[PDB]
Symmetry: C4
Subunit: 429 residues, 4 copies
């Protein structure tokens, strides 16, 4: 297959206890023997065919036990010490000054651990808990507090400012016919056009960030939304903004129709930032999961009921209200507690009409919505814990993005290590 | 009783571990003895008085342990090999190439394992997990993908086309008094009457499918709905369609009153197809259970409250609204969040009227509905797993129906097996 | 203390396994020894000052271990056989034909087992599962099917007929001032007054049944409602009916105000019968437990919010709506999804008014009601099983009432046993 | 660090079983040894640097094992038993007449056990369960019944009377312009102004109680609300009352705006007293927890959606409704089941407007609210058991407040102990 044994050791694991201990054993034996035989050449550096070291492979596939072992390897023996992943400085009883190597964790130049674990395919079974392995959890916490937190809040703040400017520009849009509109020398219009230009500028910036994202990642349609959800939403916002520009200069009023959707998305995309706050990000996570997972089925069923009874009632009535659309709305309104239940007298067979509406109300307003709540009930009872960590996963994503951009034309964003050397990082735990 | 010991061995099981091992033991003993004593005569063909082999008995009664043994039984000894149910071709470490016999599994011509599991009496305790026994799950998956998936989607699509034609025909029904109506030479009317003819044709087809179903199955009233729910709904749709035809030619306007229910049912019956999709079928299954199991109790209680307080308020008022029906609606509207709570002034004892309505609102709008939700809460926490499998059963039903119909006057729809020879099926697992 | 050893042996138990085995051991030893010493006199007949045998004491206090022992105790030794509670006739493998004595289990003349269980004080910890002890479950099932089922359905049916007559009489009440009203010789008047007479007759009958109930039971206020809930409701219906009679002849229109509550109460009392049907009685039990347990806390809190903010808003407005009652209703309507949220313009400080209403809406409509749902969620997840046994308890109550009344001036409601003898009852299980 | 070994022994625990036994062992051994070596000097009196004895330290930090031991520590060795915490008077079989010392439990003059538990920093992991340790539970129950219960009901009653007077005064406020208002010699004015004076007096009293509370406690902002919630609410009510006074004499009508919030605050603060009633205080606890914990996240998300789509729709429409506020209300009304869903025709692109509203309704009305319920569902399933103790904890707070105030210039609120002596307290258990 073109891979070394150490990768196959990764492939054969399954995160069970017996399996974990056995794979630990094989790692131990092969690493010590290889050290004794080829002390010049290091094995764990050697990549598989896809350019991943065994560490990154365990990270990529969700093999938490192997990964935990490899990150937690101390070698303190003659002629083997150089292969250690951690050491201990201070051997106090309750607390240890542990010291970890960061090789191929942030700097790998092919695929680092945070890269492969963070940007895995979403099938990776353990990406939620896998960051709780001590050195990674510690690094993300350190990077968060140290420099990324402030930049993230700045990004959130500037997004808020962008949205305030966009909202202000949109709300005070000119009302004349036939865009584009002449800038009047009054300062109010100067601010308006400035706001519009900044609004579009934000649109273009998000557009290009989205393109860079999809070009780098090349996600597939079958999993375009399971991952990459936020980026799609920002990208789509920008798409609507740009369409609004095109219509705005194409002498179409319809640009408003585009802008407002962008504006609506422009605001709701703020929830992207609430992700990464454990206290307040759970709603954004759960809205993502519900829309992607759960809305499709409920809304197919609901639309079957709405449409079926809608066409029943519109068939029944004859003569206002005679359109399928109007009756679709009138029957929708039962869902929002404003259904009139005798909204037309222009029809025949009152008993039929009322029986239909009562059947509709019982079927949706009572039966369907409660089953939605029932399913969500069992599910959330099962998956609150998984959302509570996918918060952390998105925080890791935020940190990786933050390091990638950094906007100084330099690489002085290192984490730690001031003592002889492979970028040691110290945890007192 | 008229049975052999092989069936009684099935009857004695109860799917407990000690019981399972013991029944396996007795099977092993009699298999070896039967081989050595009557090598010319096959055991498992031997039917009980009802023409059921021991395999189909273990399947029919829900005896998952015995079935799981029998389908997964390899005999590799001298003078006993011929009694094996499966063999192993490739003894690779993680995966095996097992080869299974399909004798009386899909082709029996009396009753097969899939037939007796899928069309069990619905008391069968383990019909949900019973298909998880490897060879059955593999057969259904294979035949689903291989032939039945496309035909099912075609059936769903044609049902969608039928429903679109029916809906279009119904919506554009003529408004002239006194049906039936003369065809006008304009093409719109030609399409209309063509749509009507196709609509009725679909009605007749579903009518006759339902009759064939009930004639073949002969279900009882006490369990007519617990099983066979979908077929009843399709049949009832067709019944309404036919009644609409009769009225349509009986010079009655009331055909509309019938057609719409068929129309309302026709669209709603689309959820039938949504069964068999693991994701999207969760709701349709639940609406089957919730209506059959849970609507009766809630609606008796609810109608007791609605009707009792309805009689109270209609008694109280005197003079518009004086009818029991109108007050029944006005008090229903509290259930849909549109109760006015002072909907009449033509009455006496304002304090009594308001106390009645407040008692009604608290009793239903707050207490009864929330208690429904509480009950469903416990239940769904307990039965999400059972729906998650009954998905599989509906998929099996779809497959068995598909094999039964097949509409070519030929039997070349087999799954597999071409080499020495009882329809060998390979599972690489 | 004035009781024998066996009562203390009952008292010392606590339904733990070690305790259960020990107490059964002491029972065994003392019963055999007492038989050897005093073969003339039986210990287990010996009553406390309260006239309770050790069996009825174990039953009364909720002691499953002792009770299950005593009811299921076979003694087949020389000079000890005579004190057995059950014997085994047919020792078939899977089923036994057991034969049980019913002495002091239905006929005691002081306090039988079904009496002390069904009419326990509701503190009895295990009355729910206590009927699952084989011979009691079997007795209640047999008595249910044999004669009590039909009588109960007849009782339910006659209550339905009474309620229909009452409802019909009330709905068609005369509308003229100053009751009572002279009848016209027309048949409508005769049916109305006949309906009224039967209505009152049902009222009086329920009144006297309630008095008989409370006189026999002598409940206390602190637990008047925790038990005896249904009897209180029937009694109160009757009280309202009688008050309606008094006002009806006291030349006051206000009799209507009374009648309707008895009418509404009357109809809702039908839920009493739904208890005893496992399929449909769960809602009646749930509503009983919810109203007694859970309505008080929610409605105090809710009324605090409704009243507090209601006083705030009525204070704020000045000038229609200026009364505290009207604003109480207007703020109630938010609870039923019909709150207008700008229902008055006759006030000052729109910002204050709206902030108040929004705070009110968030606090009740979104926050309080969902909290009710959350509490009930945890509770029902814990107590569905206990409701599922309160069904059994009310079944026992129904049967005991049925046997008590019986309305023939004879006692020939016995079930089985004709041969040498203490009312032998046979169970195949 | 300036502490003796006993405080460290307290610190090192973690309430695990092995830890519990080990720490009990070391503490026990060293205490006996020290008693043998320095019989003149008492150790447990020895405070840490913060002035806490080891008992109060174990109490302060949430250490159940250590505290349970120390409260339940009996020493029966020569020359050591004088340092026991309990003795046993009567060694009856099921119950013991235990006798406990209360030194530094209610009287310490630095920090007593009830002080450090009740007024812990709210991080203390077991404060809710800690009072279930027998002698404390007994102390609080005894003090509750003996004198505190009546005083608590009295102060609750007086708070109710204050609120009734305040409400009456506010409701009948004068309606002239320009406060303050001259009193007419009629009695109605005198009762009104008397009510106002008492209203303000209650305001001032609560103001000063709140100041005394915060001065004594010195809470921090980061945990001002996690603890001390009720006191903050009472204090804020008083602040609003005082602001109302200032405006009332500052010749501003706006005093009404302040008073009503105090009024709405005041009535709502009545829920404070439901805490400490297990039957009815659960809702106050759950509302505290919801508002502090859960409202912030939901309302940020909800306001993002409401505001985002509000800006969308208000942008879209042009011409009544053109303001952002009005559209914010119109879209809020969907949340309360009164959304009109076609509330304006003064706009363009009906399709866009309706799609926006439908997206808004689905996103909030169906999607956001139901998942608030889902999240709470998991939470309450996990935390009803902890609120069920937070009740008792607040009862402890009530008792400590009661003992602190006592308003007689005497200390005659002791429990028992009159013979040789450290306030012996008897528990018969
Ligand atoms: C591509 C995704 C699936 C999406 C994009 C648009 C069309 C969207 O419709 C949806 C489908 C939809 C349509 C109508 C109602 C509900 C959902 O949901 C989101 C998407 C749905 C959202 C809600 O999703 C969120 O913003 C929450 C969120 C959670 C976590 C995140 O990381 C996040 O990043 C932006 C956003 C709001 C809309 O963008 C919106 O405001 C409009 C008018 C339509 C919603 O498609
Ligand atoms: C025989 C069954 C029990 C049924 C047949 C009719 C009368 C039906 O009323 C019910 C009872 C009912 C009446 C009024 C409101 C709710 C339920 O539910 C279904 C039946 C109820 C349905 C909803 O249940 C379904 O059809 C969904 C479904 C789920 C799974 C399936 O396999 C399926 O196969 C078609 C259908 C819709 C109605 O057919 C409909 O649209 C009208 C106007 C009445 C509904 O009876
Ligand atoms: C004595 C009980 C507690 C009760 C008696 C009356 C006043 C009652 O108000 C209650 C309190 C109440 C008032 C207003 C709204 C809800 C509850 O609930 C019942 C009682 C509440 C009921 C609902 O409870 C039931 O009847 C269901 C029930 C369940 C199990 C049963 O065994 C049962 O026996 C009849 C009845 C309906 C009312 O009788 C009714 O219809 C009117 C107008 C008031 C209701 O008091
Ligand atoms: C400081 C707290 C957090 C609080 C103080 C005021 C502003 C309050 O708004 C809140 C926030 C708020 C605002 C609007 C709607 C909901 C919540 O909730 C309470 C506070 C919220 C309450 C409801 O919370 C409670 O008081 C119940 C309660 C539970 C336990 C207690 O020990 C308790 O002691 C008083 C009170 C009602 C208000 O006081 C009220 O009536 C008005 C008009 C605003 C509510 O802030």
């Amino acid at each position: 297959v073109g891979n070394t044994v150490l990768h196959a050791l990764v492939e054969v694991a399954d995160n069970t206890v017996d399996n974990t201990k056995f794979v630990t054993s094989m790692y131990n034996e092969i690493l010590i023997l290889g050290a004794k035989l080829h002390p010049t050449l290091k094995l764990e550096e050697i990549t598989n065919r896809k350019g991943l070291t065994p560490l990154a492979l365990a990270a990529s596939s969700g093999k938490i036990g192997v990964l935990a072992y490899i990150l937690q390897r101390e070698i303190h023996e003659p002629e083997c010490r150089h292969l250690s992943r951690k050491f201990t400085e201070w051997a106090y009883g309750p607390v240890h000054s542990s010291l970890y190597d960061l090789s191929c964790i942030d700097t790998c130049e092919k695929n680092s651990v945070l890269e492969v674990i963070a940007y895995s395919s979403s099938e990776t079974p353990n990406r939620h808990d896998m960051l709780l392995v001590e050195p990674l959890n510690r690094l993300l916490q350190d990077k968060w507090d140290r420099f990324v937190k402030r930049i993230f809040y700045f990004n959130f703040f500037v997004y808020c400012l962008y949205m305030i400017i966009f909202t202000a520009a949109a709300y005070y849009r000119p009302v004349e016919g036939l865009p584009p509109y002449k800038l009047k020398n009054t300062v109010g219009d100067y601010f308006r056009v400035t706001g519009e230009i900044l609004s579009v500028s934000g649109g273009v910036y998000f557009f290009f960030r989205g393109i860079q994202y999809f070009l780098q990642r090349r996600p597939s349609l079958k999993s375009l939304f399971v991952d990459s959800y936020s980026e799609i939403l920002f990208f789509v916002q920008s798409l609507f903004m740009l369409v609004s520009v095109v219509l705005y200069f194409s002498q179409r009023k319809e640009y408003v129709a585009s802008m407002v959707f962008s504006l609506a998305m422009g605001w709701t995309n703020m929830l992207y930032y609430t992700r990464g706050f454990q206290q307040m990000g759970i709603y954004a996570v759960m809205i993502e999961k519900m829309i992607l997972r759960d809305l499709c089925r409920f809304m197919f069923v609901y639309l079957v009921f709405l449409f079926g009874f809608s066409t029943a009632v519109v068939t029944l009535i004859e003569d206002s209200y005679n359109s399928l659309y109007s009756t679709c709305l009138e029957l929708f309104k039962f869902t929002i507690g404003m259904g009139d239940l005798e909204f037309t007298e222009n029809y025949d067979f009152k008993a039929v009409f009322i029986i239909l509406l009562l059947a509709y109300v019982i079927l949706t307003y009572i039966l369907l919505l409660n089953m939605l709540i029932a399913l969500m009930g069992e599910t959330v009872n099962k998956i609150a814990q998984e959302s509570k960590n996918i918060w952390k996963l998105q925080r890791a994503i935020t940190i990786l993005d933050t390091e990638k951009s950094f906007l100084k034309c330099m690489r002085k964003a290192f984490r730690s290590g001031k003592l002889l050397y492979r970028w040691c990082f110290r945890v007192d735990e």
